[PDB]
Amino acid sequence: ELRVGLEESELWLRFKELTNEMIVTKNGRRMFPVLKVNVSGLDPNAMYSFLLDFVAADNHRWKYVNGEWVPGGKPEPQAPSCVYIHPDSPNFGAHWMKAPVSFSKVKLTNKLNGGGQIMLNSLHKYEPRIHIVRVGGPQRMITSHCFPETQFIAVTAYQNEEITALKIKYN
Numbered sequence: 001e002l003r004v005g006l007e008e009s010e011l012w013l014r015f016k017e018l019t020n021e022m023i024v025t026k027n028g029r030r031m032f033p034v035l036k037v038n039v040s041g042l043d044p045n046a047m048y049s050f051l052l053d054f055v056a057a058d059n060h061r062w063k064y065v066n067g068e069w070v071p072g073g074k075p076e077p078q079a080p081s082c083v084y085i086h087p088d089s090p091n092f093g094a095h096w097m098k099a100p101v102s103f104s105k106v107k108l109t110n111k112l113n114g115g116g117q118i119m120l121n122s123l124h125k126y127e128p129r130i131h132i133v134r135v136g137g138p139q140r141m142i143t144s145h146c147f148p149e150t151q152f153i154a155v156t157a158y159q160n161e162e163i164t165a166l167k168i169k170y171n
């Protein structure tokens with residue numbers, strides 16, 4: 001059985017208990033914490049691409065009102081985010097299993113852009129999700145996995161100073 005684990009869940013959970021926030025910029029901002037995934041049970045000899053996307057966790061716009069995040073009352077459907085390909089892709093199972101797969105190079109933006117960067121809607125809540133895609137073989141296969149511990153709200157600047165403090169303390 002293919003196993004997918006979050007690395008450093010300890011720390012992600014401290015961010016989640018405060019409501020996590022991730023900065024988006026026109027040019028694209030790298031994430032902290034970085035999503036790092038432990039994977040076992042791949043065929044060491046099979047070929048795989050690791051993909052990262054962001055599900056809109058709800059259909060609402062969120063606002064930081066008197067020190068607390070609160071959803072709006074006017075939900076709109078949220079079209080899916082674009083996919084980020086891990087730059088080690090495509091690669092052997094052995095490659096992916098020798099150390100945590102670290103998405104250190106994904107950039108989050110609020111503006112449609114050349115590419116690389118992934119465009120999110122500011123003040124929406126997102127749940128990171130990976131796809132593990134077996135490629136090159138006869139049988140294509142996809143395994144997907146969400147990471148609720150890594151949920152955040154996309155912001156153009158931090159609202160909760162307790163997040164600001166944690167971001168610096170641990171970087």
Ligand SMILES: CN1CCN(C(=O)Nc2ccccc2)CC1
Pocket residue numbers: 049085086087089090133135
């Ligand atoms: C620079 N990039 C990195 C490697 N890459 C892919 O892995 N694409 C792909 C193709 C089919 C299924 C999943 C991913 C495209 C080029």
